[PDB]
Nucleic acid binder design. Structure first.
Lengths: 452, 82
RNA sequence: GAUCGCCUGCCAGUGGAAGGCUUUCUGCGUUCAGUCAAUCUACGCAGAGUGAAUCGGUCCCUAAGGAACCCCCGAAAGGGCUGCCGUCCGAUGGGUACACGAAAGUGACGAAGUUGCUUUGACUACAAAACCAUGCCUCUCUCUUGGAGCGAAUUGGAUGAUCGGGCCGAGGGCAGCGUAGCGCCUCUUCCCCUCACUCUCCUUUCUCCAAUAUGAACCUUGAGUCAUCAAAGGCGAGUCUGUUUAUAGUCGCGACUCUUGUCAUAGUCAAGAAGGUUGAAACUUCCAGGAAAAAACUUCGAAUUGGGAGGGCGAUCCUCCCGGUGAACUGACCGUACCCCAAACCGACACAGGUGAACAAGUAGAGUAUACUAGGGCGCUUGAGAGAACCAUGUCGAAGGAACUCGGCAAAAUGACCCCGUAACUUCGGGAGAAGGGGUGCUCUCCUAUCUUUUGAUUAGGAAAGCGGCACAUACCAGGGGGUAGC
């Protein structure tokens, strides 16, 4: 990123910059996620400006850790002189473990602290509770809450919100409401729109809290004109009640921010507009968007291209597809996959095959990979062999399997049966059925034995 | 700088004098004692103590001595430190 | 254990070479040593103690040199010969990776500038003031409500008197200020669907002139990501604009402007992250003209396991050429304690003697000179009284100023920086710091410079006005000078 170039040309620079500027740069790059340059700075400007607070030590600990370096994190931690091992350090360890999913060492360290008589704060408890809510033992939180009450802590808005996410997992909507009232029962909130948006994140189950969604809106519109924290937990409720006006109004009241508003805003709203299926509005908005021409690269083409492909509007999707790299950037793997999705749903064997395999082995890997994850193979085969064509066996194996085995042969419980009962077209694969080795069905083991 | 002054009352009394100054004007040459006796405060006891607090303030950077000399006559003004 | 001291650029500190050779430590003891009565130890007994691919040796080389052979010479011994093609010699060069055999080297004064002569951070609690809110009169997205002044017409200008024209008044939020008050980074996840990073001066003295941290700065090399232009003469998209098409309109587009790559092909590479490595030296000035080593290093010459071809038809198990040819484990031996300006070394001694280097916080100071300190080390292994003659080493001494005496020996004095001025003589370079004088503190102001160590002030110089002292290089530090013979 150009952040690296800015800071890197800076380091060999002058007008030695204040700790305040530095700390603010950290708090910026951490927010935007730039653990790498935030750490690199807080290292070099430590080499030059050394003495850092115990709090800043905790900050650096979090940076080291959430550089995905949990190992080096803990090592650095036991490097810290025990004098600099106060609540802040232990809390950074914890809130790192939160993501790190290391419940065992986490709870061990937790009880360790507890014996050490060094109290854990709200965010500590809360990171713990979120670790619970992902470990599945989310019902385990209110007992520790009782302990918290016995330990004189105020479980903040975040604790109430993970309570909501915890008593949703057990279908206690009355528990959600009683938490909601526990909010106003104690003068310790001061609740934010996170409260109400966490209410909605579960009440998207029925739709009986629309005034509370408007309350989300008004607490939002206080804390901001309108900022991007009302649009990630709201798109399906943007499909909920108010689907015409409360959304066609929020869209423009948001654009009242008046930048050439973000790809993220348009990508939070256009999938909802296609959910409501107002295709001319989607098309007008896309056309004014590419008039804005402000980095559409894929975040705006892919969605309504996919809407075209979903309907069957493949000429209109295709023109736009092969237009977008005439002017700007790339296209995504799943942008290829939606195209393959239409090709499959329409059954076209060879072309669906080509586009799929292109997608899987092109450099569009999402997260260093584009294994086509859903079991679309069960349909792919039902179109190769079960198209009742005899070379839905030879190419079936040699291409279907050849595509699905660049990642791993595990998914092949359909595939192996699929050829065993695709041959079934012509048996010439007993030579093959040894290398067919890993695991195969027993019912279809008769199909197998049939060849020899 | 580092002159005498009481420890914490000094902050209240300094804010008192700074109020006085920024209301009135950088004219507050010594015998500012009159201004700080009419917009009065009892957190002083004498002219010497007054100038002592003045020095302490200007050290803390609340006041600033400045020059305006006219003819061959030396005049000096405690601006309220813009 | 505690107050007090002494040292802090060659008596007292740090790592140690040379030397010592258990003197280090642990327990026991006090017969011997200690310049004591010694429970103490550098003392007696008893026991333990020193880890090293990288340190230092070992080793490779050679200089000064000592010899070996052969040779030459001499009564005997032995002397001479380093080229006759060898072996030893560190205070030098080579330290980590084979050995073997040739071109490059290794490799080189002095002096003076220029480098080395380390710098950072230190508290926006937490971070600033457009948005639109708001608190306001103002005002017409828009009017609407009757008044009142203001042209209309004659027929050919002295008239005659009413609709096309028209101007302030009561009510309605829109176009002008001030009024509470308050936060405008981007998820380019490909999918958001509820979450933790939120852990700091608004309350402070003690940056009231310190405590804590850092220790090189630049090429040269290889291997994974974008942007290249090699990979082709191939486009949309908004502005600017020709008129009307009306299922209701967008239809059309002549022409101008504005960014902007793909279809693959590879082709060079700019921008981040890993390893040895110049700095550790450079440039000028000179004349007295400034080590050796096939040793290591850098190439070829050859290389012998690894390949692929070798036309494989010489069983030739070989031929031509390509590929590597020291690469991962491994890395022995010996020193390692202790003191190393000293109580342990050389001085017969627990002796004011002698003993290479390397490092050395602050203040003032050009200074490593000199005071005073912290750190570190040490309190000198005889003391307690009294305060006579006498002696050693020091402070002051009137008046006198060399009268002392062989002789102003010693003692005194002068001293520093800046400025003023400076003689005879002359080999014309010098005498010359010639002689002879003045100034030296601090305070504020002004201007000058300068200074990024940010905020405009701070430190020095020089102006000019005070202010105190008998005294302002106040202590320490620091030239007596001149005249004239002999050699």
């Amino acid at each position: 990123v150009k952040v690296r170039q800015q800071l890197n040309q800076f380091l060999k620079g002058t007008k030695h910059v204040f700790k305040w500027e530095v700390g603010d740069t950290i708090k910026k790059l951490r927010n935007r996620g730039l653990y790498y340059p935030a750490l690199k700075l807080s290292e070099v400007m430590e080499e030059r400006g050394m003495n850092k607070t115990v709090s800043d030590q905790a900050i650096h600990l979090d940076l080291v850790a959430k550089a995905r370096e949990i190992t080096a994190g803990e090592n650095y931690f036991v490097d810290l002189p025990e004098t600099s091992k106060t609540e802040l350090t232990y809390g950074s360890l914890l809130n790192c473990y939160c993501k790190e999913l290391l419940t065992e060492k986490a709870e061990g360290l937790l009880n360790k602290m507890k014996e050490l008589n060094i109290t854990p704060s709200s965010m500590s408890y809360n990171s713990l509770m979120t670790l619970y809510t992902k470990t599945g033992e989310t019902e385990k939180v209110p007992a520790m809450i009782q302990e918290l009450k016995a330990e004189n802590v105020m479980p903040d808005s975040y604790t109430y919100n993970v309570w909501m996410r915890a008593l949703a997992a057990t279908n206690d909507i009355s528990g959600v409401e009683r938490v909601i009232e526990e909010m106003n029962r104690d003068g310790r909130v001061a609740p934010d729109w996170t409260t109400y948006s966490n209410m909605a994140s579960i009440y998207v189950d029925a739709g009986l809290s629309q005034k509370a969604e408007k309350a989300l809106q008004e607490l939002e519109m206080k804390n901001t004109q309108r900022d991007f924290t009302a649009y990630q937990f709201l798109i399906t409720l943007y499909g909920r009640l108010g689907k015409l006006t409360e959304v066609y109004r929020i869209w423009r009241s948001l654009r009242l921010a008046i930048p050439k508003t973000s790809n993220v805003a348009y990508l939070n709203m256009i999938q909802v507009l296609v959910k409501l299926n107002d295709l001319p509005g989607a098309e007008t908005l896309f056309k004014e968007w590419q008039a804005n021409c402000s980095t559409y690269d894929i975040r705006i083409v892919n969605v309504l291209i996919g809407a075209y492909a979903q309907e069957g509007l493949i000429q209109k999707a295709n023109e736009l597809k092969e237009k977008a790299p005439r002017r700007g950037g790339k296209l995504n793997a799943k942008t290829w996959e939606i195209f393959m999705d239409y090709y499959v749903k329409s059954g076209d064997m060879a072309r669906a095959l080509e586009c799929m395999s292109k997608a899987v082995s092109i450099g569009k890997g999402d997260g260093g990979k584009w294994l086509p994850s859903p079991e679309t193979v069960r349909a792919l085969m039902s179109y190769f062999e079960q198209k009742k064509d005899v070379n839905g066996a030879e190419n079936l194996l040699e291409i279907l399997k050849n595509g699905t085995d660049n990642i791993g042969a595990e998914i092949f419980e359909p595939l192996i049966r699929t050829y065993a009962a695709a041959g079934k077209s012509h048996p010439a694969m007993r030579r093959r059925l040894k290398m067919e080795n890993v695991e195969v069905n027993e019912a279809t083991k008769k199909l197998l034995d049939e060849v020899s | 700088i580092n002159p005498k002054v009481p420890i914490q009352e000094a902050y209240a009394i300094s804010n008192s004098l700074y109020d006085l100054f920024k209301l009135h004007g950088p004219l507050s040459v010594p015998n500012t004692w009159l201004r700080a006796q009419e917009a009065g405060v009892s957190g002083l006891n004498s002219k010497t103590h007054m100038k002592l607090l003045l020095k302490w303030m200007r050290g803390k950077k609340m006041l600033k001595l400045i020059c305006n000399q006219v003819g061959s006559s030396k005049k000096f003004f405690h601006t309220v430190l813009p």
